[PDB]
């Protein structure tokens, strides 16, 4: 199928041009479900976090974006309670030129650049705007938790 042919190319690109601070691979023997890891970027409240995600593709990929969820506990204005991510390029701004590598690096960039007008987590959105001191403390807890996560 076209989706499976595309996903083998996504995987090869990750090996040839490895992105810094992120990684992804198929789970077990299923090409349509991937595991992924994103490191919290240095110089941010998320620094040193080792966050685990799952990516689910459909047979309509790359014409349809995959669904991406954090499995690790998260505290971020654009991340829902169930780990789902409000990021424009994973919804209405999706393009077939994006792949696993670019999706992961886009999510990585979102961690230190939250969108205030999309409050998926209303408390994280409020603290980020009002009390940035308390925002970093709440993010610190989930950084620690991401280390003994499996």
């Amino acid at each position: 199928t076209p989706a499976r042919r595309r996903l083998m190319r996504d995987f090869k690109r990750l090996q040839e041009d490895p992105p810094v601070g992120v990684s992804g691979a198929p789970s077990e023997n299923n090409i349509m479900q991937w595991n992924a890891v994103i490191f919290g970027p240095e110089g941010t409240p998320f620094e040193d976090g080792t966050f685990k995600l799952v990516i689910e593709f459909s047979e309509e990929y790359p014409n349809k974006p995959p669904t991406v969820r954090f499995l690790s506990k998260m505290f971020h204005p654009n991340v829902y309670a169930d780990g789902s991510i409000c990021l424009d390029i994973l919804q209405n701004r999706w393009s077939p030129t994006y792949d696993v590598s670019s999706i992961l690096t886009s999510i990585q960039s979102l961690l230190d650049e939250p969108n205030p007008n999309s409050p998926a987590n209303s408390q994280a959105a409020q603290l980020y705007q009002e009390n940035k001191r308390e925002y970093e403390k709440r993010v610190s807890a989930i950084v620690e938790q991401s280390w003994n996560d499996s």
Binding site: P18, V20, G21, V22, S23, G24, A25, S27, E28, N35, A36, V37, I38, F39, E42, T50, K52, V54, L71, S72, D149, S150
Partner: peptide
Amino acid sequence: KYRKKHKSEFQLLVDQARKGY
């Protein structure tokens, strides 16, 4: 549940993501 069952797989991914950090 999921993270625990795929412990080995996630640790390989953590090691790959750590490089150059």
